[PDB]
Amino acid sequence: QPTSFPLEHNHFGVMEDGYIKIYEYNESRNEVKLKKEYADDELELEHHH
Amino acid sequence: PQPTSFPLEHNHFGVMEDGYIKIYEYNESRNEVKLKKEYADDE
Amino acid sequence: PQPTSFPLEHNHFGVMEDGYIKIYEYNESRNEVKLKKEYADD
Amino acid sequence: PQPTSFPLEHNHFGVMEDGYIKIYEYNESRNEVKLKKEYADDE
Amino acid sequence: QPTSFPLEHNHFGVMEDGYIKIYEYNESRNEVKLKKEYADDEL
Amino acid sequence: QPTSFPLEHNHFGVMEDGYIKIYEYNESRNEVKLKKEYADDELEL
């Protein structure tokens, strides 16, 4: 069920279940870090003021 | 139905899932995601 | 049936869903998504 | 079998579905999509 | 259950059940060909 | 259940079954190589 997309500066995101997860790949250290995690519902809430 | 996504300019991106397309922005400096726009894909 | 999408220039993007190709634009300035064209058979 | 798609230069893009590769072009100015090439699954 | 992604110079990859295939689209010649084929079996 | 995404300098990622693998395609040597592998839970640390 997951889908992924690219972002700037070698970041990328995954959307799986209700959760969006943002990652970074550091080519220099050759490693990835999970940078941020949101439940889509809290995002929806934020958006409906 | 399985979601699909796609990138957009200025660190925005799109997620299309079940009759809806949602556009988000990732702000790298604040390290935040915001939902910016919802769209009913039924035109 | 099972959608897949892809990016295009100037904040346009497209999606393929059961023999149908739909092209859209996101206009960041107006914060609005619009359907721009649709096809099935080329 | 499900589809998967991907971008290319100059507003072209491709779809892979049921063992087939189709490449399309989107002309923003005419607001049109032309299929450009299409391969059965083989080199 | 295919997935694809773009690469530089109009190349693109498709991953199908443990097999990566890299292609190139040559817009000018309107041609696609298989550049490499690889299986997840990694060292 | 697999999804992929592009990165800088001809690298690309494959997300698949809780596992993120990261590759590089050397157009010059015309070859690809796995470079890093992770479990999503590892990253969740």
| CA gap C32, C25 in Å, rounded | 8
Residues 15-34 of E with CB under 8 A from F: 15, 20, 22
Backbone angles phi, psi at C19, to 5 degrees: 65, 0
CB A14 within 8 A of CB A20: yes
F3 and E4 within 8 Å at the Cβ level: the answer is: no
Q: Do chains B and E touch (3 or more CB pairs under 8 A)?
A: no
What domains can you pick out in chain A, each with its CATH number?
Answer: 1-49 (6.20.140.10)
> Residue F20's closest CA among F43, F10, D28, F31?
F43
Chain F residues in contact with A5 by the CB 8 A cut-off are: 5
Angstrom distances, CA of residue A17 to CA of A7, A9, B1, C10, D10: 20, 25, 12, 30, 34
Report yes or no: A47 and B35 within 8 Å, Cβ to Cβ: yes
- Residue B9 at interface with chain A, using a CB cutoff of 8 Å: no
| Way it was determined | X-ray
Q: Which long-range contacts (CB under 8 A, 24 or more apart) does F11-15 make?
A: F11/A25, F11/A27, F11/F35, F12/E5, F12/E7, F12/E13, F13/A4, F13/A12, F13/A25, F14/E3, F14/E15, F15/A2, F15/A4, F15/A14
A26-A32-A33 Cα angle (round to 5): 110
**For residues B39 and C13, what is the distance between their CA atoms, to the nearest angstrom?**
14
Using CB atoms, which residue from F1, F9, F22 is nearest to A32? F22
Tell me which chain B residue has its CA closest to the CA of residue A9.
Answer: B28
User: Which positions in chain A touch B32 (Cβ < 8 Å)?
Assistant: 36
Angle at D35 between CA D32 and CA D38, to 5 degrees: 165
- Picking from D4, B27, B9, F32, the residue whose alpha carbon sits closest to that of residue A3 is D4
Total Cβ atoms within 10 A of residue C39: 17
Q: Do F1 and A4 touch (CB under 8 A)?
A: no
- Give the Cα separation of F43 and F15 in Å (integer): 13
Q: Please report residues of D whose CB lies closer than 8 A to that of E22.
A: none
- Name which of C4, C23, C42 is nearest D34 (Cβ-Cβ): C42
Task: Provide the greatest CA pair distance for chain D.
Answer: 34
Q: What end-to-end distance do the CA atoms of chain C give, in Å? A: 19
Rounded to the nearest angstrom, the gap between the alpha carbon of residue E2 and the centroid of all alpha carbons in its chain is 11
For the four alpha carbons of D29, B17, B1 and E12, in that order, the dihedral sign comes to positive
